[PDB]
């Protein structure tokens, strides 16, 4: 009976491929052919935040466009005031192995995680003037890769045991589990409407989930290796993903197929982080060649190079109002560009 | 600059001072990454998802990390600055020796471990000696080249042993040393060792190997090489 089921699966995959091919009449390159290019952009560093004594792994911008949080291998979580380069809070971590960090939309909680398979939630605003551990969520089998706050009481996490989970902070237990991937889950990206999210894993595929229903809606496979970073278009009907094949790709949701690819012959290293601009015209990517690249999303041509780091670029973020870009790397320094 | 901004700057300066003190205090320990495939007794090498071990010798502190399913390449990038990687393999059996050799190939030629040295432990020597004296299993069944292998005439065997045990252990050590010197040039070296189930002294060997590694680094950075 296994052979019949395998044959049915193959036939269904062929039917899906034919259905996708039937919907491709024109390419994004041709439709955007007669569009004025953005020219050449040049960004200069404005603030250099120093004080970390180890490699920086992740960062997250605040909702007020002024405060940010950074995590490093030394075991410290540091809250930075971007305007004056002052340190607001320094939090020591129980485990020195950290892979992600998050900032609450309300601005009174932070999240951390790593190789301890535990998501730690810290409370910022409280009496007696100190930061205390508010919650320790456990239940994952592998290491956590990313975490994004949904509200003050719900969070979403992705782990290395090929799964994602939605956690209620007050109760401390999982309410929904997403299990569709076959490889390590590396990145997740939420949506502006807080109803859907995309996940990218090591099986060279991406999945679109439903927060309420809890079932996978669409899957996308167009990469030749594992994908490291995933983003989400401000419109909410597309996303972008970068892999260690020295290639980025833009994927649609309604057409359910790939749109455009960003790659060049001179780049052979992997891609660590991706992000979008306010209008979606600019796609910022971090590479292992100690450099950051800026791509035109509608034309697939480089328009700028950020070169200020002497080690591997790890984390990249764009401000909510689109006024600055924060990049952190393995040289214990994170910089702001404008 | 208002008074509140001045107070914030003072608080930031105090935070910086505490961070610098903590970083200075945390730099005096050596870090080692212990890993082994299976059935090698890596948990009993030093008698004294992350497992941590303390041990101190000659007023020097060592912190050993044991992480514990198939592809470890994703989480091995973090351990790109440790002092050494301790690889333990059980030489008593021969069915899964090729798996250990392939694992050593994968670890030695890692992209992120091009400047990290490996200390090799060949455990369960008593079982190997008992098996080779019994005469039941033969190496030639698994490795054909054992039939035509040069004897260790030049090298000096340990005082008191059968020549067959010496030949077998030298063949295994040569198999690991050749694959070690296959790539990596002089960027990183391997240090082979022979260990039994109950060995009183094992931290001294790690201490000596770390001393040699730090000596090589010092020679490199003192503008001498």
């Amino acid at each position, epitope marked *: 009976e296994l052979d019949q089921l395998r044959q049915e699966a193959e036939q269904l995959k062929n039917q899906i491929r034919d259905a996708r091919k039937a919907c491709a009449d024109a390419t994004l390159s041709q439709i955007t052919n007669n569009i004025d290019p953005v020219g050449r952009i040049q960004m200069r560093t404005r603030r250099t935040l120093r004080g970390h004594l180890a490699k920086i792994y992740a960062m997250h911008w605040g909702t007020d466009s002024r405060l940010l949080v950074s995590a490093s291998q030394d075991g410290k979580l540091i809250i930075w*005031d971007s305007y004056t380069t*002052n340190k607001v809070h320094a939090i020591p971590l129980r485990s020195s192995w950290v892979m992600t960090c998050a900032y609450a939309p309300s601005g009174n909680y932070v999240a951390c995680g790593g190789l301890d398979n535990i998501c730690s939630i810290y409370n910022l605003k409280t009496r007696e003037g*100190n930061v205390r551990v508010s919650r320790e969520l456990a239940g994952h089998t592998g290491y956590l890769s990313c975490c994004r706050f949904l509200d003050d009481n719900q969070i979403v996490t992705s782990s290395g045991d090929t799964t994602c989970a939605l956690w209620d902070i007050e109760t401390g237990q999982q309410t929904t589990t997403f299990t569709g991937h076959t490889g390590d889950v590396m990145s997740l990206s939420l949506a502006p409407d807080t109803r859907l999210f995309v996940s990218g894993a090591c099986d060279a595929s991406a999945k679109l989930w439903d927060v309420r229903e809890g079932m996978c809606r669409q899957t996308f496979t167009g990469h030749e290796s594992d994908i490291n970073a995933i983003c989400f278009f401000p419109n909410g009907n597309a996303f972008a993903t970068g892999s260690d094949d020295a290639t980025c790709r833009l994927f649609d949701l309604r057409a359910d197929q790939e749109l455009m690819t960003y790659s060049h012959d001179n780049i052979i290293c992997g891609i660590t982080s991706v992000s979008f601009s306010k209008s979606g015209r600019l796609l910022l990517a971090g590479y292992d060649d100690f450099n950051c690249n800026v791509w035109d999303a509608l034309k697939a041509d480089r328009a700028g190079v950020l070169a200020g780091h002497d080690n591997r670029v790890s984390c990249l973020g764009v401000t909510d109002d689109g006024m600055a870009v924060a990049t952190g790397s393995w040289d214990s320094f994170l910089k702001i560009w404008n | 600059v208002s*008074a509140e901004d001045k*107070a914030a700057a003072e608080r930031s300066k*105090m935070i910086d001072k505490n961070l610098r003190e903590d970083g200075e205090k945390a730099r005096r320990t050596l870090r080692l990454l212990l890993l082994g495939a299976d059935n090698s007794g890596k948990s009993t090498i030093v008698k004294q998802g992350i497992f941590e071990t303390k041990f101190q010798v000659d007023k020097v502190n060592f912190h050993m990390f044991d992480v514990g399913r198939d592809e470890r390449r994703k989480w091995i990038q973090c351990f790109n600055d440790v002092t050494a990687i301790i690889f333990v393999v059980d030489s008593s059996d021969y069915n899964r020796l090729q798996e250990a050799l392939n694992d050593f190939k994968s670890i030695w030629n890692n992209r992120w471990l091009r400047t990290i040295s490996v200390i090799l432990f060949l455990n369960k020597q008593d079982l190997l000696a008992e098996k080779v004296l019994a005469g039941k299993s033969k190496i030639e069944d698994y490795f054909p080249e054992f039939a035509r292998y040069t004897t260790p005439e030049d090298a000096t065997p340990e005082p008191g042993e059968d020549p067959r045990v010496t030949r077998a252990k030298y063949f295994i050590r040569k198999e690991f040393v050749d694959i070690s010197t296959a790539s990596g040039d002089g960027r990183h070296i391997c240090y082979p060792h022979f260990t039994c189930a109950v060995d009183t002294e094992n931290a001294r060997r790690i201490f000596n190997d770390c001393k040699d590694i730090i000596l090589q680094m010092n020679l490199r950075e003192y503008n001498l090489v």
Partner: single-chain antibody, 229 residues
Framework: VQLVESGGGLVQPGGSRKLSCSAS????????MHWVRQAPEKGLEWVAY????????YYADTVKGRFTISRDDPKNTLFLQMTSLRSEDTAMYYC??????????????WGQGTTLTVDIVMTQATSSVPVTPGESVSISCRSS???????????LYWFLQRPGQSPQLLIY???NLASGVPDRFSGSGSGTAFTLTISRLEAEDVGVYYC?????????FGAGTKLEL
């Protein structure tokens, strides 16, 4: 969070005294401290200030040269040493905590105080206003110079003192509402003209209201506005 003040009594002029403020319930080493005093039948006058880490000390011109500040962090205590006492030093002394970072709310907690017996001008035109429950009330405070800084922060603070109680913070930086305060309190205004508004007034809101400035030292208070039924 508790602050207890000790030291007081009848003192002959020219004597010396030592007042203590003991803290229990919060991280004392992370908070700067202030000593404030209130005359028997007058308003609030700033006296002295000690910083965290003892790196910055400020004194008032009236008590300069004869008042000393100290703090002990392991023992969690603040000391005020008084020498050459005069007849104008009879008052009630309050020990206040304050913390300074982006988004903090200084002057959040006040102590009970202890009794002792022997440049910018803030004006509150009104003195006493009759009020009734369920009626909106607006009180105004004026300043000699502009309290608005180039960074966009207007430094004005509001305090309420009930009969037989220590003052508590109501509004900081002229717009932000402190924790534990009902939403019926609001504050607004511009340079040298600020207004505090209370809607749906009810009991336990009677007392004396004070407006304070934090732009530059020394800190100065207002005369005070009294609300009576």
């Amino acid at each position: 969070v508790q602050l207890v003040e000790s030291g007081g009594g009848l003192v002959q002029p020219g004597g010396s005294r030592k007042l203590s403020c003991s803290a229990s319930g919060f991280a004392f080493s992370s908070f700067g401290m202030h000593w404030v005093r209130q005359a028997p039948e007058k308003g609030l006058e700033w006296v002295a200030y000690i910083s965290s880490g003892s790196g910055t000390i400020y004194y008032a011109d009236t008590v300069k040269g004869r008042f000393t500040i100290s703090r002990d962090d392991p023992k969690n205590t603040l000391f005020l040493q008084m020498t050459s006492l005069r007849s104008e030093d009879t008052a009630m002394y309050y020990c206040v905590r304050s913390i300074y970072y982006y988004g903090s709310s200084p002057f959040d907690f006040w102590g009970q105080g202890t009794t002792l017996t022997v440049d910018i001008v803030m004006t509150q035109a009104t003195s006493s206003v009759p009020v009734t429950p369920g009626e909106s009330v607006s009180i105004s405070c004026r300043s000699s110079k502009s309290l608005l800084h180039s960074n966009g922060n207007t430094y004005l603070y509001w305090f309420l003192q009930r009969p037989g109680q220590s003052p508590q913070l109501l509004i900081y930086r002229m717009s932000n509402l402190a924790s534990g305060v009902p939403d019926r309190f609001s504050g607004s205004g511009s340079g040298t003209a600020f207004t505090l508004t209370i809607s749906r007034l009810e009991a336990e809101d009677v007392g004396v209201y004070y407006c304070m400035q934090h732009l530059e030292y020394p800190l100065t208070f207002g005369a005070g506005t009294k609300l009576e039924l």
